Design a protein around this ligand. Structure first.
Ligand code: ADP
Ligand code: MG
Lengths: 318, 255, 122, 128, 317, 128, 156
């Protein structure tokens, strides 16, 4: 709760959807109504929705938190069916954003005992996985048309093992996991580099440099992770000049991972930066290679491309 | 069908975690009494009756066999949870995968300390037995000292050698996806490591070494690779020829 | 209390026990040599060692003697320090494994009773 | 009433933890099967419905508004518990207080890392 | 597994049969069909079973894993009935191996669960203690004889305080702990001398002599273990007279605790040894005294009576 | 019988832990609602009514007495568990035996520091 | 636990005893960071009282955070500032203990009834560092701060 799901999916509609050639569908399921109003009016301004003509490229379906369980249990199907039409009756690349697909599951659990069922683990209905499967298996590209779905997924009490999120993992092709722990340090988006995965992260797909860099970043991050609690007690003095040197670059990479979002200007108090893939790989490549060992950690905190942290480094003088 | 007609089959059940969920679904809806995690009392019997059908038939019954590789997903490492508890006890052993190992660079993310095969050598060829025993001993010694690594700023040459073998071997245990190698190629690269030839190479290079060395022996030294099978083990000749190859090669590798 | 937590802390504190354990061994060896060279030389985090001398602080011959005594003392103190520190970590591991198993038991029972309550009210 | 007549009202719900306990009672006595922690399945809905009623109206609707400050008691400081998280997942942010900051003399005992506003500077004057 | 368990069991059978006339019963609670056939054919090859002449000393009762809970919950009972016959009808001292007691509790749990009962703490059946008490009590010394039970114990989640293990502890009088570390030191049987314990280790029961020796061996061994640290770091060169003797003696005792099992012959090519309780007590008693200090370690390794230690030594020079 | 007839008796209950488990087997079979460690609500009364019966009568009721030495097994010295605290809340003090002291050879293994006697001093001999 | 938990909202002042404190010999085993009072206000108890009470509580909370470190390395890696907090905290802990009349049998001390002013005074002084020269045990099981001194002298 409150780590960035919605900000991040707003960022994605802003970058991916605005440039998208084809229709888009947004289903607000069990979320905030104010958010609905926020989005609607933002899309009218960007012209993505046009109220005066037929240029609208996004259909909206809403079933928020102020509605009863049956509605919240069925809205996502409503959203989903609209998207399905555009898919089959056009083949056209359809974008589908759903926030938050957990509400379909929570809604069910909500009327489960009145339906006569013995509870399953953690209070959920016994048909959770089947219920989820018949729904999710419709959210899919097919030979006829392709749907690029982005589903915000709530995680009860922050526990990723909770029946609901846990059962959602296999329905995906790439998962972006957010952490309160990271958010708590000011790193945003609060993504967990050691828990986010993607089917296409394979050297025979993103190529070798991309793959290698990524693997390189996760290893330096996992190294540091496993030392934190240790030197926290014992002290840094025993770390060899080579080890303590990695702890510097780990921390830099950690921060270089943050990025001001257009959509989060009201919260960062910073101008949103957007970084191209190639410049992303170079920035990280370079950090891993000792290059910016001479810049201060804060240089890397909340910037765009690597060049910005070099700048910032200078400004830090006074 | 294969097991009973002198043929051999391999079966992977991916996953048994989900079959258990489906079965629990039906059991609760049928109002049967729920237990731990809401599973029915006969959940263990579901899997046991499945996995026991996997078997090695005697010569009188054709000699066929069925091997089974059942998968289980744990939640945040909890191997004591209900279904994992059950399947761990039914099976003849476990290959444990870990996230921490994965991101550290260890892939397959197999945990060599915790995984087991009660069958062990019984189904390992002599050549692999030979090199594997040494490697399992060395790695075991490594695990013991592996913590003193980053803080032992004055470790004796003895414990310092344990560490070097241990990094070396760990690296030889790494392996690219979708490229299963032949047993002879496995002993050959393990041989390198367990014979100390890579104790000088820098750890970061070992992965590049293995790939070059292996491509080289596969090309020029087929004859040696076949001998490694024939002899069953590392013959006195094979053991000399390897020594020549790795030395020269390594030398060229660090030119 | 939380299984996630306790498990983390256990991983840390178990590492800390070994590291510290090895520091005790290093310190012990260094001290041993020193001790031997103690008398001969008297003819010509390390506990509160550094602390002591500094708090109170407010050619050749002397330099050599001082340094010789100092090293002996330092390595002795650090050996003690780590010996105590690894001992503290062991005790703490033990006490956290207990906690981990109490919580583990209670959790299992709690989820069980929730399930039965909901089944029984049907 | 204020909300829908161009006036602005603030409501404090002190506290929603006790309300949930009273609901749970009523529910169980009505013979509705208990769910997680004994609470009924729809405990989120119980609170969700309520808090969505706090809103900002547009000028066509009078431009009035209802602002809410629900209060939730944790046990032993766990903000990642069922109820707590249910409510956090409804409101537009949360102010989390702590006894350890309180006793260290940080009063108000606000924990900056765990507290947030989902409205940001849009709710501040330019000055602030 | 991999710590000599099937070999220990097989020896005990053969040892209790030769020295007491009583047979053994082996109850496999949720046996895995594969390990069961292996245990069978390994019993045949060790001789404890005979597919031909009536020299078979063990009766096997198998409750396999593919069987419904009630079957696996009953098998210990069945095997217990067989064992009762030898006690109450033939007056023998029967041995009853139950592998493993944990799977008897689980089947217990699963049965109760199907029977619609409310589970108790940690999920076990409401009747855990009674289910346990009614099987275990049948295991005792009666006027006609006795049943002694060797039961394999799995400890769930490594938690000795789990309801399952804590219930079993209620009825155990001793524990034999098999260890991989000891196996690795080639010590067979791989019995850890400081973990394994017994209730009847009281002078009022095994007498004052036995007691004092046992304590003596336990102590010498605890001291040695401690010295390890110093030995390696401060070097094993500044050990006082008293300190070097402990280390040398400790190592003789430790090696004298190994012993060629009569069942091992088939592979070890060495005659198995069954040591009488007098030779055992006396043997370690003398080592403790230092009477055999003038002998090389390897003289005590894999021998029998104390006599055999001296013998081997002279030969090894 | 002894207590009410001017005689003195000593009862030893070995042990109340096992009795509580039997009572738990009865309760769950009766489908009474499980609570801490799956014990019924009344496990406290189960021991309280019992131990209140040990007492010291004055001279007008014959001056007899009944002394009770109930026995409770703990798991890994956890004297904070439900049953152990329950009996601690009934009796007049406790003798604690530590696993550590015993294994270390100290017998009897009493933890003088954590053992108490709420009403024994007055009954201790002047010589002591 | 449901019961106690639900009971806290019905009270104006709470005294939360502790098994870990009692075990240390501290009696009454009151937890100085978990017992509160609605009267604890500067306009009710006056600023002097309020200040000292908040002072004590902050040093006890500060000590408490240091415990995580003390536990493994001990006090050797503490700054000289930190140590200071640890010495006073520990004299505050003990000086919170007090012989009750009703517990004479178990403490082996005569009961003490300390007047408010005298309570403020003693705690103020420990906070000031006024007694940083007395040994902890001096402050255990006494009445007014004066007795801590007398007890200190006796120890020598
Ligand atoms: N990208 C970001 N940059 C800065 N702050 C952020 C960012 N994303 C989220 N936040 C902060 O965290 C709060 C919670 O994010 P939000 O998306 O609303 O939570 P949830 O994931 O529950 O939908 C936001 O109001 C904002 O203050
Ligand atoms: Mg959201």
């Amino acid at each position: 709760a409150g780590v960035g799901k919605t900000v991040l999916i707003m960022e994605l509609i802003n970058n991916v959807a605005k440039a998208h050639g084809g229709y888009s569908v947004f289903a607000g399921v069990g979320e905030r109504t104010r958010e609905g109003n926020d989005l609607y009016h933002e899309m009218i301004e960007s012209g993505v929705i046009n109220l005066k003509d037929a240029t609208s490229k996004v259909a909206l379906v809403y079933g928020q938190m102020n509605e009863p369980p049956g509605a919240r249990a069925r809205v996502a199907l409503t959203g989903l069916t609209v998207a399905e039409y555009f898919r089959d009756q056009e083949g056209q690349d359809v974008l589908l954003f759903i926030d938050n697909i957990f509400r379909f599951t929570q809604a069910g659990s909500e009327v489960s005992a009145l339906l006569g069922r013995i509870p399953s683990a953690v209070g959920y209905q016994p048909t959770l996985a089947t219920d989820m499967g018949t729904m999710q298996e419709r959210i899919t590209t097919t030979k006829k048309g392709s749907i690029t779905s982005v589903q915000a997924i709530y995680v009860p009490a922050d526990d990723l093992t909770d029946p609901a999120p846990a059962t959602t993992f296999a329905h995906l092709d790439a998962t972006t996991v957010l952490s309160r722990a990271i958010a708590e340090l000011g790193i945003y988006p609060a993504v967990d580099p050691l828990d986010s995965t993607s089917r296409i992260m394979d050297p025979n797909i993103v190529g070798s440099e991309h793959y290698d860099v990524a693997r390189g970043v996760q290893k330096i991050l996992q190294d540091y992770k496993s030392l934190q609690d240790i030197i926290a007690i014992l002290g840094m003095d025993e770390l060899s000049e080579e080890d303590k040197l990695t702890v510097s670059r780990a921390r830099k990479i950690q921060r270089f991972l943050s990025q001001p979002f257009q959509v989060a200007e009201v919260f960062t108090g910073h101008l949103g930066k957007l970084v191209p893939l190639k410049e992303t790989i170079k920035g990280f490549q370079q950090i891993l290679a000792g290059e910016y060992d001479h810049l201060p950690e804060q240089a890397f905190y909340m910037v765009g491309p690597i060049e910005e942290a070099v700048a910032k480094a200078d400004k830090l003088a006074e | 069908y294969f097991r009973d007609n002198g043929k051999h089959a391999l079966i992977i059940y991916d996953d048994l975690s989900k079959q258990a969920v489906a079965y629990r679904q039906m059991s609760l809806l049928l109002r049967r009494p729920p237990g731990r995690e809401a599973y029915p009392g006969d959940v263990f019997y579901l899997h046991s009756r499945l996995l026991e059908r996997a078997a090695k038939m005697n010569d009188a019954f054709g000699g066929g066999s069925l091997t089974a590789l059942p998968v289980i997903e744990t939640q945040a490492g909890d191997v004591s949870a209900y279904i994992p508890t059950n399947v761990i006890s039914i099976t003849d052993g476990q290959i444990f995968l870990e996230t921490e190992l994965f991101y550290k660079g260890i892939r397959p993310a197999i945990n060599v300390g915790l995984s087991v095969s009660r069958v062990g050598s019984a189904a390992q060829t002599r050549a692999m037995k030979q090199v594997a025993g040494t490697m399992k001993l060395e790695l075991a010694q490594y695990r013991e000292v592996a913590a003193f690594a980053q803080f032992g700023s004055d470790l004796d040459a003895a414990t310092q050698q344990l560490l070097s073998r241990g990094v070396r071997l760990t690296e030889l245990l790494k392996q690219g996806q979708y490229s299963p190698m032949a047993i002879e190629e496995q002993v050959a690269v393990i041989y390198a490591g367990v014979r100390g030839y890579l104790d000088k190479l820098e750890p970061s290079k070992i992965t590049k070494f293995e790939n070059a060395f292996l491509s080289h022996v596969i090309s020029q030294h087929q004859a040696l690779l076949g001998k490694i099978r024939t002899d069953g083990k590392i013959s006195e000749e094979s053991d000399a020829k390897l020594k020549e190859i790795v030395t020269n090669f390594l030398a060229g590798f660090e030119a | 209390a939380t299984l996630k937590d306790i498990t983390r802390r256990l991983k840390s504190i178990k590492n800390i026990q070994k590291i510290t354990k090895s520091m005790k061994m290093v310190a012990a060896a260094k001290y041993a040599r020193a001790e031997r060279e103690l008398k001969p030389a008297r003819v010509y985090l390390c506990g509160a060692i550094h602390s002591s001398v500094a708090k109170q602080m407010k050619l050749a011959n002397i330099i050599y003697y001082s340094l010789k005594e100092s090293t002996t003392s330092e390595q002795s103190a650090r050996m003690t320090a780590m010996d105590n520190a690894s001992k503290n970590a062991s005790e703490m591991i033990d006490k956290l494994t207990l906690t981990f198993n109490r919580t583990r038991q209670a959790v299992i029972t709690k989820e069980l009773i929730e399930i039965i309550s909901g089944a029984a009210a049907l």
